[PDB]
Write a protein that binds this ligand. Sequence first.
Ligand SMILES: O=c1ccn([C@@H]2O[C@H](COP(=O)(O)OP(=O)(O)OP(=O)(O)O)[C@@H](O)[C@H]2O)c(=O)[nH]1
Ligand SMILES: O=c1ccn([C@@H]2O[C@H](COP(=O)(O)OP(=O)(O)OP(=O)(O)O)[C@@H](O)[C@H]2O)c(=O)[nH]1
Length: 326
Amino acid sequence: MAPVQKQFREFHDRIKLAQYDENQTLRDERDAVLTAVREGLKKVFADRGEAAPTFTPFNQGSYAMNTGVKPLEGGEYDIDVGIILNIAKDDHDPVEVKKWIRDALKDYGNGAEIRRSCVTVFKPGYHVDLAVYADPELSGGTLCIAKGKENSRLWQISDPQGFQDRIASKLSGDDAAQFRRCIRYLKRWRDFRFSSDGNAAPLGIGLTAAAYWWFQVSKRTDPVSQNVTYDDRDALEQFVQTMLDNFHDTWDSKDQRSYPRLTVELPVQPYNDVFEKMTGMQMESFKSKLQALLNALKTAKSRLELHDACKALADHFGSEFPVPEK
Ligand SMILES: O=c1ccn([C@@H]2O[C@H](COP(=O)(O)OP(=O)(O)OP(=O)(O)O)[C@@H](O)[C@H]2O)c(=O)[nH]1
Ligand SMILES: O=c1ccn([C@@H]2O[C@H](COP(=O)(O)OP(=O)(O)OP(=O)(O)O)[C@@H](O)[C@H]2O)c(=O)[nH]1
């Protein structure tokens, strides 16, 4: 077993959050927001003179892909759900349709809010982000998400279940488990070292897509027993170095200088750069902290003392990274 593998697996155990199918609590919080939309829509459509539209819900995001992490103390769960309304996208404005859902949830928890890509409702210790889609069968065979706010706004081609399939299918078995561990590690790093400025933080979706493009398994197969051991430290070092290698200096005509930018395309529609909202200064800070993480992964490998190796990693992963006593 590689040095520090035991402590990576212990760290993983402490940061992992059980996915929808293994987590009764998340399923119940999800279903309650779903019920409140159904109840809420009757009331919105009472002023319309016809039944509220039917919708089909589906799991989205980290809790659907088994890449979920516990928030830091006083952080929030992010429950992602898709609802496909039984409507023709050409019959309705996307902000109009998001309004139905916001107004539906006006009286649920602390409030409801139309965002660029979802309706978000707030409750004690978590939010539910509802992605709102039109019916493909009524919309010319495309699944489209309702994009835009009052301050803008279209039906954008979307493929959340294709993205979910891509993450599930890249690898299998214990290879796929390492891939998922390494996404979770970077999400905890994100939470620990980008707490000062939430806005500057790389999105979980961006770390996940980066892993889809660039993650490689690190394992060894004993030449005697063929017993297999994983090396998460090494897989992370190769992955972080590959991400660093894909930053490009990008000219900014306003500032008259370049900023390093990492472009990470979603591998399904709409194939957008998931990091496009990050500013050049945020990208420079992202790159510098990634390089500092890479340097710690390399220092960990060479330390005489397991204590010193684990301390070097704890400095980037936070208080759940085990540090054995010297
Ligand atoms: O830029 C984006 C963001 C989100 N999405 C779609 O919405 C889903 C929810 O996007 P989230 O931003 O909630 O990401 P996540 O759940 O995968 O990551 P963490 O919260 O664990 O940090 C994503 O998993 C993807 O399907 C996009 O297609 N593009
Ligand atoms: O394709 C997408 C994009 C986003 N989403 C879902 O929408 C959530 C919010 O994504 P938004 O795109 O609505 O955030 P925003 O730009 O409004 O952010 P601020 O104005 O507050 O800075 C994401 O976390 C994800 O759950 C999807 O489900 N699919």
